Every structure is written in structure tokens, then in C-alpha cells.
RNA sequence: ACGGAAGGGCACCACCAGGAGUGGAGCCUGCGGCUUAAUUUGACUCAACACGGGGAAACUCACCAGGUCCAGACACAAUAAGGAUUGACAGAUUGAGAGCUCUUUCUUGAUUUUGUGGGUGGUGGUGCAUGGCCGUUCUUAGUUGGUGGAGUGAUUUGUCUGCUUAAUUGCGAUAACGAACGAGACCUUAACCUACUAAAUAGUGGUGCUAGCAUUUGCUGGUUAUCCACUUCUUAGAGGGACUAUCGGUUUCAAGCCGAUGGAAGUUUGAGGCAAUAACAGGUCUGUGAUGCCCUUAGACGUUCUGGGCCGCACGCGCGCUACACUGACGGAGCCAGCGAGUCUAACCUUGGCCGAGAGGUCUUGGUAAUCUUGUGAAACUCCGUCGUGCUGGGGAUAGAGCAUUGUAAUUAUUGCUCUUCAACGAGGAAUUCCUAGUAAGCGCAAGUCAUCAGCUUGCGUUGAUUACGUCCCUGCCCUUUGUACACACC
């Protein structure tokens, strides 16, 4: 799709920081809860990011549920430059 | 499937349930990476990371 | 040293009378078995929700209809206990299916 | 907040329905078999009745993490306020659902139609069922649709006991030619019922007397 | 119509077959018997049963009944 | 399985004895037809036609007249940092304050572009490729196995002349005995509990406080807590109750059926929910991010935006609504229901107070509700009048002028009110539907839809009949018997 690198990074960042993403199937939502960009930006960014492996997509009652893979983790590892043993939400919180 | 082979269904179908009690009886005993991301954008938050000067006329 | 008469009303609302009557008398006798002052389970009109629809996905056929319904049961019990037994009575006595709502106040 | 118990109690049903939906997709290959969500002081507890919780959990506890996060993000729960717990289920032999997606993941696994279903019926019966029934509607290898019944032992079809004793589930298996309908019926032995009536309303047992040795002229005992 | 089903008359039969000492021409007490003396499942079907074990009990007094 | 063979049955989707009608009229509404830029489409005997919850002003939306966008993943190639690509002010252009496009010349920074391959969306096709769901057969009573009897065998007997039942419901007959699915049981609802547990979100009596009338004590109110007490009414928990009981007639003195007495209740107690095996090329790809394959895929069958259209009117058909009056219209006046529903990250149900003939407005207010709207003071209906049989004061179609409400938008007139205009229709041919007791018919309500709109539907309660309580004549279907050269089963 056609989108500024700003809005690009914000997603990709968010995906690494979280590992998981959700987004109702609506386009023209201007900005969606959490990630500060166009809703349409989220979905077609992920969807791209998916069809190259990297992330699992799921649908159900109008909402898109995104799972990052492992090979994707390595890819976000690149696009953000960050070193191995970085993050993802693959930690077990405090003692939670 | 034709009824000309239906004996060999029930048999092969039985053994399927045989192995499905094997797997479920064998399942009646059977047999770090730190840093984070909001803590590394605040860790590598020390400067030397930009530049700013302009505006004239 | 704490405690004081706090004048309490517990609404109990659910859709499964067995659990709901369970939790209702269970609360009424457990809190009574240690002596209080109350108005026992006040059953309000079991009200019923209705959805009335055609069976057919499309339009064809004789016009069979088929109303579903959902039974909502709600109950309140008026208590007067002190702070301790209150929160003792609310945190536990829980039940997967019975909405507990414990308010306060004479207003 | 601030709802009405009318719009509330319905809404909660929707929440269940949508949750159960999203799980039934995201956790097939793990024999997802239903949820139940506990509404507590502090938390909201969700119990994931799947047969295979090792693959619900994942490496040192991920996946269920992903799943929470998902479930979390969507309904706008704050971290902590929602919590998921996976739980294996006491025999899959009497869960209609368990056997449905068994078959999907049996036929789809390149396997006979007779072998698949017939095996399924036998495992369910060996699992201590009172009776079982399986139906394959759809089109298979030839282009006119046909439909087979597979059913062993005892099942009832009418009245209230329906609700109590038989467990129904359809599943849509999506193959190369077209899609089939897997449809399962498991009937649990009523004598085991635990929470309910332990017999059909047809059940009317006569208890058996005793061999009396009568006569013996009067006489009385003293104490 | 009110033709009693087989389960009714079937149970009725074998109740009268082994408990003629006990039982009467009184439905009321033949009823109370069925609680103790058998396991039914329904309040309804139990009367519907006891009622007809009472009918038979009644006519037997005036000659045999087959079965 | 079928038959344009015979024999038995079953049913107000059959008739009988009747009722209320439709068929005639005006309009409402669906279908055909025609017309049209388009008048989107499915469906056509019961089992298409107030059906797709289909009451379309935009949306919906599929149609038509035109205008934007890619939301064309990913892979390779091509281009290319000297710029692969993005955007626009004014102007022209345009329905348009769309940089659509062009003039002009800044901006942008590898996110795209061009090429193939590969996807993708699609209310595009196919319901004669399917799932799922549903309708129909079915207002039906059918289906199967154990041990035994027959048959080389498929098979059969059980599962049957009869009688009985709503029922393969039973009794009885009996090479069968004894059973299971389905029917029944069951579950929900409406009925009965001065028995049980209670209640300022339900109501009663007493007592305070208090108004009126009478006075002799009384009578009718007020008073969400001023207190005391109770659960008859109301509410919902647990129990109970009916089993066609008692007795009598009738019957193979069998199942049963009928009658009287009792009873809350005695038509499966009344009404539903569920409902075996099997069939259909029933319907639905236009509910589905259910799906095969076909088709298209940037001048798009994608999508959005602007406007029109689905309502278009010589006419054929169907469900309805309002009527033709005096068992009435009108006008005051009495004044009585039950199922429902309602506002949070909000503008729902609305009491009350003013203003206005009205529709409505405006100020407030209660309610997330047994607490407030609401006792939903609803409608028929009951009463005292005015009209007097005259297309009349029955009837209110068509039409004019005005004021309001919903909505971004009301013209092809969304609805509401007022004045006026005052049609057809004098009980409706051949035909044909629905119906057996709180039912029919009359009557209004609430809920679905819903911004606004019900002449529809789903339930609800109010007033409350006549005539059956039978048959097999018509119709419809079931069961035997029988024929068959059918078995893809008379399409
Ligand atoms: Mg049954
Ligand atoms: Mg039944
Ligand atoms: Mg007649
Ligand atoms: Mg007539
Ligand atoms: Mg119709
Ligand atoms: Mg349009
Ligand atoms: Mg391309
Ligand atoms: Mg191509
Ligand atoms: Mg589609
Ligand atoms: Mg079809
Ligand atoms: Mg179909
Ligand atoms: Mg067609
Ligand atoms: Mg009838
Ligand atoms: Mg033999
Ligand atoms: Mg036969
Ligand atoms: Mg009472
Ligand atoms: Mg009487
Ligand atoms: Mg066809
Ligand atoms: Mg469909
Ligand atoms: Mg139309
Ligand atoms: Mg009047
Ligand atoms: Mg005025
Ligand atoms: Mg308020
Ligand atoms: Mg008039
Ligand atoms: Mg006139
Ligand atoms: Mg309305
Ligand atoms: Mg309609
Ligand atoms: Mg023959």
C-alpha cells in the first residue's frame, strides 16, 4: 500500500512491543484505538506482513486478530535494527 | 466406499479406536531472554540521536 | 476494633434458579445462622425476554414462526451487618452465573 | 457502566457467544471444546476446555499469553482485569464437539469415509456412551450429493430428555471439490448423570420383595 | 381418548403380580405405595400408573384377569 | 415405487348443521402485464402472490445516468537517488470547495510505479455442483433388533380379521414370546391451594396526623415510613392436586366409551415446545469472512460519491382496510384490560407546569425500571341527548388552500392537524376461504420494523354468540388387496 514511513514504523514498533494486534473490519476509521494511525493503514500493513509469513491472521465477528510468528519476530528484529534478545511479549510479567 | 469392502472398513476402523485408547492411556502417565521494548527505548533513550537548526528571512 | 451497622441491600440476578436459589438461601441462612436483622429473599416478577422470528433463512414455505425466550430472575435480600461480615459475605458466596450487586444507603 | 439488567443479561450472552466463536476458530487443532467465563471480584476468569492444553500454553507460557492479549485488547479489558486458564477435559468421548472436529481432522487428513466415521462411533462407544450418531452430508469424489448415517446403540429423539442427555454438533469441512457436513450425536449414560435425573422419564423400576417364612403361631418377646 | 399406554399397564401388571398383600381398591393409598414400593420418575405417570393398578385390583375381586 | 383396479378408514387446510365473510365497490398492498434511462431480483397448485422478516425519500441497493478511489497481498523483473513515487493553492474544467482532468511549479523520498506471474474483492452465474437452514409429505403413525416358527435364498413371521384410540393407542385373535426408536412419558404456559417460606420496588386491616359530609357511634378521602400487625388479594420458591375418581349404564362385561355426583380442573384437562426412518434435483450461493467451479478484476460485475429508479399505469390476479347505516352516525357523559418497551459513555420511555383550536411547542421532572411513564382512565361497550330514512347527519375516495413534526434532503406530494371539496358503494354473479367454547366474530392495545411512516405481522387482553359433538357425499391423504415388462421407479 502507499503509506509514510512514520505510520509504517508505529505499527511495526507496536507489533514488536506487543506481539499481538486487533482491528475491527472498518476502513475510514481515521484513527483506531491504540496505534496512532489510519485504521486502513493497520490492516493492509499486517495483511502484507502476513502473506510473507511473519504474522498469523484470524477473523471472526468482524475483527481481525493478529498473531506474530517467530520468523516474523526475526523480521521485526531487522526492520527496527534492534539486537537479538530484544523483546516481544514473550516474557511472563512480574510474577503475574 | 462399496459394501464389497465394508468388512475391511470395520477392522481398520476398529484399530483406529485401538490406537485412540493407546494414545489416551499413554496420556494417563506419559513423560531469561531479558531487555523488553518499553525498557530498551527508555534504556537507549540517552541522546546523540537528532539535530535541529533553520528558519531565515 | 472496627464494625458498625451499615444497612445493606443485596440484589441477586441470574437466569438459573437452581444456582440462584442456591446462592439466595445460602446467603440468608449463613448470615442468619450468626444472627442479624433482615428481609428475606424478595422475588421480583420473573420477567421474560422474547425474540420472535421466521424459521426460514429466506422467504419460501408456509409462514412458520418460532419465538425464542430468555428467563431473567432477580432477587434482593435486605441486610444489616457490620463492615467485616459484609465483605466476608460478598467476596466469597460467588457463583458462575449469578450477578451479585451489593449496594449501600438509606437513599 | 450503567446498563439495565435487561440489556445486560443479553449482552453477557453475546460476550459468551463471540468468545466461544473466536476460540473455536483460533484453537481447532487443539480440540477446543467450549469455554466458561467466571465473573469475580477483581478478575474475569476464562476457562479453555480443550483436550490438549500443552498447545494452548506454548513455550514457557506464551500462546495463552497471545490469546489473553487478543481477548484483552478487543473487549477493552485493562491488563489484569481479564485472565485465561486452559483445562484438559475428562474424556472427549462424550463431547459431541470433540468428535466433530475429530472427523474433520480425520477426513481432511486423507482417509476413508467409512473408516473415519465408523472408528469415531466405536471410540465414542468404548468411551462409555449410551449411544452415538454421525452423519456425513455433502459431496465426495463424485458430483451428486449423498448422505450417510453412522449410529451404534441407544439414542432418544423427543421431549425434554433431549436437552438433558444428547449432545449435538455440526461442523463444516471444506475440501477441494465442495464442503461436507459432519454432524455428531453423543448420548451419555443417564445412570451416571451427577447433576440431574439419573434416568429417562420412561424409567419405572419395581423393587423385588423377599422370601417370607410365614405361619409360626403367636408368641411374644420381652425386654 | 384416554387409552393408557403399555408402560402404564405393564408396570401395573407386575405390581399386582407380587404385591397383592398390600394394595387395595383405594387409589390414594395404592399411590403412596408406588413411592415406597417402586421407582417411577414423574408425579404424573405415577398416578397414571397407580390409577390403573387400582382398576385391575378392583375387577380381580370379581374374577381373574389375564396376564 | 406406481395404476385412469377393489376393500376398508382418517380431517372444518373435507363435507354435514351453521356463523363471519372474501368474490361486487373505494382505497391499501403484493404478483402479472404494459411502460421505462432504469422501472434491481427471488418465488407461481395445496407447498408463489401483507412472502425473502421486503413498511425502498439518502443509506439500504442489487437497477439506471454520470463522477472518484485500489483497500491490485506476496514473488521476479523494469525503472530510479541526477529522483522509483506522493500531494496541491488559484484558474480552467465539474452536479460538486474532486488537483478527475489541463494550464502553472512547488512539494514529496523508495512507502510506489510499469511488466508478467500470483492473489484479491464481487447483492456477478450456477440452490441442477454443495454445506447449513428450512418448507413439504406429516392436522401423519410409522421404524427396528434379540430368542423362536417358514423359506436354498432375497425374505418373512413378530408388525394381525376384529374392536377400541388423537396414536403399531390398546384389548383381543395368535408360531410367536417378549422389547427399543418414534406416539406416550417429558418440558413450558394458563388454571386450583385462608396449607409452607416472605416482602417501603407487592397489597390488607389497625393506629397516629388530617379534609368533607353528618352528627349518636358513622360515611368518603388525604398522609412512600409516624408507628403496630397480618399475607386473603399481588409476586415466585418449595410442596400438594387428577388418576378420566365415585357410582351407574353400554360393550366380546376386554380395552374402552357414555351419563350423572363430586371436583380448581375430567375434549391428549386447555394451548404450545420437542419429535424416529425416508423422500424432494422444494426453497435459500441476495444472511453469513459457509463453500466448489464459471465468470469478471482498473474505461471493474471492486468501492464510494451526485441524481433518478424499485411507487412508474389502457388493464388481469391475491392478502387486506373502510363501508353501504336507525343492533346506527353524531354529541356530551359514565369508565374498564392484558402481553409488552424503554437513556452510557447518552438523548430512550415521559408524568407535571405553562402557550396554542389542533397538530405541536416550551420549562422542568421520574425511571437502566414490580420503584418512573402506567391504574398504560385503550377500544368496542354502558347512559342522556340531537338527527329520522331521504346516497341523509350513512360513506369518506378524489381534490384545493394553510399551519406543524421527522430528517442533510419531503417535489413524484414520509406522517400529523384545519377549512373546504363529498365520489363509488342500497349486502355484492359463477365461484371460494376460516372456524366447534372464553372458540367465531366484533374491539382496541403492546412488541417487531422504526430518524420519520402500519391499512402488515407476532402476541395480548376486552365484549362474547349461532350451530355441530355426525358422516364418507365432494375433496384430500393414509391402510390393505391386486397388476406391473417400472427399480434413474410413471417426470
Ligand atoms: Mg420416546
Ligand atoms: Mg412427545
Ligand atoms: Mg356447509
Ligand atoms: Mg356466502
Ligand atoms: Mg401469506
Ligand atoms: Mg445512490
Ligand atoms: Mg498487478
Ligand atoms: Mg493474470
Ligand atoms: Mg458473498
Ligand atoms: Mg434443491
Ligand atoms: Mg438444500
Ligand atoms: Mg433460479
Ligand atoms: Mg381439527
Ligand atoms: Mg433356517
Ligand atoms: Mg405389515
Ligand atoms: Mg397467598
Ligand atoms: Mg359437575
Ligand atoms: Mg428445482
Ligand atoms: Mg444461504
Ligand atoms: Mg416493491
Ligand atoms: Mg358514541
Ligand atoms: Mg394560534
Ligand atoms: Mg434522572
Ligand atoms: Mg362521516
Ligand atoms: Mg352526503
Ligand atoms: Mg410502532
Ligand atoms: Mg412486511
Ligand atoms: Mg410385486
Encode chain D in three state secondary structure. CCCCHHHHHHHHHHHHHHHHHHHHHHCHHHCECCCCEEECCCCEEEEEEECCCHHHHCHHHCCHHHHHHHHHHHHCCCCCCCEEEEECCCCHHHCHHHHHHHHHHHHCCCCCHHHHHHHHHHHHHHCCEEEEEEEEEEEECEEEEEEEEEEEECCCCCCCHHHHHEEEEEEEEECCCCEEEEEEEEEECHHHCCCCCCCCCCCCEECCCCCCCCCCCCCCCCC
> Which residues contact residue D159 at a Cβ distance below 8 angstroms, ignoring those fewer than 6 apart?
D201
CA dihedral D46→D47→D50→D52, nearest 10 degrees, is 100
In DSSP terms, D181 is beta-bridged to D137, D172
Pick the closest to residue D102 from D177, D28, D8 (CA basis): D28
- How distant, in Å, are the alpha carbons of A44, B15, B17, D106, D122 from that of B11? 51, 6, 10, 17, 11
Strands D83-87 and D44-49: parallel
Measure CA D86 to chain center. 16
In this structure, what are the phi and psi dihedrals at residue A2, rounded to the nearest 5 degrees? -105, 110
Report the alpha-carbon distance of residue B15 to residue D122 in Å, rounded: 10
Residue D172 Cβ < 7 Å to strand F: yes
Chain B residue at shortest CA distance from A89: B36
Q: Can you read off the three cell numbers belonging to residue B6? A: 465394508
What is chain B's length? 57
Q: Which residues of C touch D10 (CB under 8 A)?
A: 49, 70
- Kind of pairing, strands C8-14 and D83-87? unpaired
What contacts C6, CB < 8 A, 6 or more positions away?
Answer: C80, C81, C82, C83, C86, C104
Q: 10 Å Cβ neighbour count for E61?
A: 8
Q: Which residues of D116-151 are buried (b: 16+ CB within 10 A; e: fewer)?
A: bbbbbbbbbbebebbbbbbbbebebeeeeeeeeebe
Q: Is D42 left (phi over 0), alpha (psi -120 to 50) or beta?
A: left
What does the domain layout of chain E look like in residue ranges? 6-61
C47: three-class secondary structure by DSSP: strand
Method of structure determination: X-ray
Q: What span, in angstroms and rounded, lies between the C-alpha atoms of A73 and B39?
A: 18
Q: CA-to-C1' distance for A3 and F81, Å?
A: 19
Q: Which residues contact E37 (CB under 8 A, 6 or more apart)?
A: D206, D207, E15, E19, E22
The Cβ of residue D14 has, within 10 Å, a number of other Cβ atoms equal to 10
D203 Cβ neighbours under 8 A, 6+ residues apart: D190, E39, E41
A10/chain B closest Cα distance in angstroms: 13
The domain defined by E6-61 folds into Diphtheria Toxin Repressor; domain 2 (1.10.60)
Distances (CA, A) of D155 to D78, D161, D166: 47, 11, 8
Cell numbers for A14: 507496536
* Chain E 33-62 residues in 7 Å CB range of strand F: 41-45, 47-48, 50-52, 54-55, 58-59
Contact E42 D201 (CB under 8 A): yes
Which residues, listed in sequence order, are joined to residue E38 by a DSSP beta bridge? D206
CA–C1' nearest nucleotide, residue D140: F130
Helices (H) and strands (E) in chain E, counts: 3, 1
- Helix, coil or strand: residue C99: strand
Query: What is the rounded CA–CA span in Å between residue D136 and residue D148?
Result: 5
Could you tell me the CA-to-CA distances from C51 to A53, C48, C71, D10 in Å, in that order? 44, 10, 12, 11
- What is the structure's resolution, reported in angstroms to one decimal? 3.2
| C-beta separation of D184 from D175 below 8 A | no
Closest nt to E63 (CA→C1')? F253
Q: How many CB atoms lie within 10 A of CB B13?
A: 23
CA D36-A67-A4 angle, to 5 degrees, is 135
User: Nearest C-alpha of chain D: how many angstroms from C96?
Assistant: 5
User: Do the Cβ atoms of C64 and C2 come closer than 8 Å?
Assistant: no
- The Cβ of residue B17 has, within 10 Å, a number of other Cβ atoms equal to 19
D179 strand-pairing partners: D174
- Cα angle A61, A27, A8; round to 5: 110
Identify the CA nearest to A46 among candidates A76, A78, A91: A76
Burial (CB < 10 A; 0-12, 13-18, 19+), residue A43, is buried
CA distance, residue B13 to nearest chain D CA (Å): 4
**By the 8 A CB rule, do D50 and D43 touch?**
no
Amino acid at each position: 500500500m502507499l503509506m509514510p514511513k512514520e505510520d509504517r514504523n508505529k505499527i511495526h514498533q507496536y507489533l514488536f512491543q506487543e506481539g499481538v494486534v486487533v482491528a475491527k473490519k472498518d476502513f475510514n476509521q481515521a484513527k483506531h484505538e491504540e496505534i496512532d494511525t489510519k485504521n486502513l493503514y493497520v490492516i493492509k500493513a499486517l495483511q502484507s506482513l502476513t502473506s510473507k509469513g511473519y504474522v498469523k491472521t484470524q477473523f471472526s465477528w468482524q475483527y481481525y486478530y493478529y498473531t506474530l510468528t517467530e520468523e516474523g519476530v526475526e523480521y521485526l528484529r531487522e526492520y527496527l535494527n534492534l539486537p537479538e534478545h530484544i523483546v516481544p511479549a514473550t516474557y511472563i510479567q512480574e510474577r503475574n | 466406499g462399496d459394501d464389497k469392502k465394508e468388512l475391511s472398513a470395520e477392522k481398520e476402523a476398529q484399530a483406529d479406536a485401538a490406537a485412540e485408547i493407546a494414545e489416551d492411556a499413554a496420556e494417563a502417565e506419559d513423560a531469561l531472554q531479558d531487555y523488553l521494548n518499553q525498557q530498551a527505548n527508555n534504556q537507549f533513550n540517552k541522546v546523540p540521536e537528532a539535530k535541529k537548526v533553520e528558519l531565515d528571512a | 476494633q472496627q464494625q458498625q451497622i451499615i444497612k445493606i441491600r443485596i440484589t441477586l440476578t441470574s437466569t438459573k434458579v437452581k444456582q440462584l436459589e442456591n446462592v439466595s438461601s445460602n446467603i440468608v441462612k449463613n448470615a442468619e445462622q450468626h444472627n442479624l436483622v433482615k428481609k428475606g429473599p424478595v422475588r421480583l416478577p420473573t420477567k421474560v425476554l422474547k425474540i420472535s422470528t421466521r424459521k426460514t433463512p429466506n422467504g419460501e414455505g408456509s409462514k412458520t414462526w418460532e419465538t425464542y425466550e430468555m428467563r431473567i430472575h432477580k432477587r434482593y435480600i435486605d441486610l444489616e451487618a457490620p463492615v467485616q461480615i459484609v465483605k466476608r459475605i460478598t467476596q466469597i458466596t460467588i457463583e458462575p452465573g449469578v450477578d451479585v450487586e451489593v449496594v449501600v444507603a438509606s437513599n | 457502566a450503567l446498563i439495565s439488567k435487561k440489556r445486560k443479561l443479553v449482552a453477557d450472552g453475546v460476550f459468551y457467544a463471540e468468545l466461544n466463536e473466536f476460540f473455536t476458530r483460533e484453537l481447532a487443532e487443539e480440540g477446543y471444546s467450549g469455554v466458561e467465563v467466571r465473573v469475580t471480584p477483581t478478575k474475569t476468569e476464562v476457562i479453555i476446555r480443550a483436550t490438549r492444553t500443552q498447545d494452548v500454553l506454548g513455550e514457557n507460557g506464551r500462546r495463552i499469553n497471545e490469546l489473553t492479549l487478543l481477548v484483552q485488547k478487543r473487549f477493552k479489558y485493562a491488563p489484569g482485569t481479564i485472565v485465561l486458564y486452559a483445562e484438559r477435559v475428562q474424556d472427549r468421548g462424550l463431547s459431541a464437539v470433540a468428535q466433530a472436529e475429530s472427523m474433520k481432522f480425520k477426513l481432511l487428513n486423507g482417509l476413508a469415509i467409512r473408516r473415519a466415521a465408523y472408528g469415531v462411533v466405536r471410540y465414542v462407544m468404548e468411551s462409555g456412551a449410551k449411544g452415538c450418531e454421525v452423519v456425513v452430508s455433502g459431496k465426495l469424489r463424485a458430483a451428486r450429493a449423498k448422505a450417510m448415517k453412522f449410529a451404534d446403540g441407544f439414542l432418544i429423539h423427543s421431549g425434554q430428555p433431549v436437552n438433558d442427555f444428547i449432545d449435538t454438533a455440526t461442523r463444516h469441512v471444506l475440501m477441494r471439490q465442495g464442503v461436507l457436513g459432519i454432524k455428531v450425536k453423543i448420548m451419555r449414560d443417564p445412570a451416571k448423570s451427577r447433576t440431574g435425573p439419573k434416568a429417562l422419564p420412561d424409567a419405572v423400576t419395581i423393587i423385588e420383595p423377599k422370601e417370607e417364612e410365614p405361619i409360626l403361631a403367636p408368641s411374644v418377646k420381652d425386654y | 381418548g384416554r387409552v393408557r399406554t403399555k408402560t402404564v399397564k405393564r408396570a401395573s401388571k407386575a405390581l399386582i403380580e407380587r404385591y397383592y398383600p398390600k394394595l387395595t381398591l383405594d387409589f390414594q393409598t395404592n399411590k403412596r405405595l408406588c413411592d415406597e414400593i417402586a421407582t417411577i420418575q414423574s408425579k404424573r405417570l405415577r398416578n397414571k400408573i397407580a390409577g390403573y393398578t387400582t382398576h385391575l385390583m378392583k375387577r380381580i375381586q370379581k374374577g381373574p384377569v389375564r396376564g
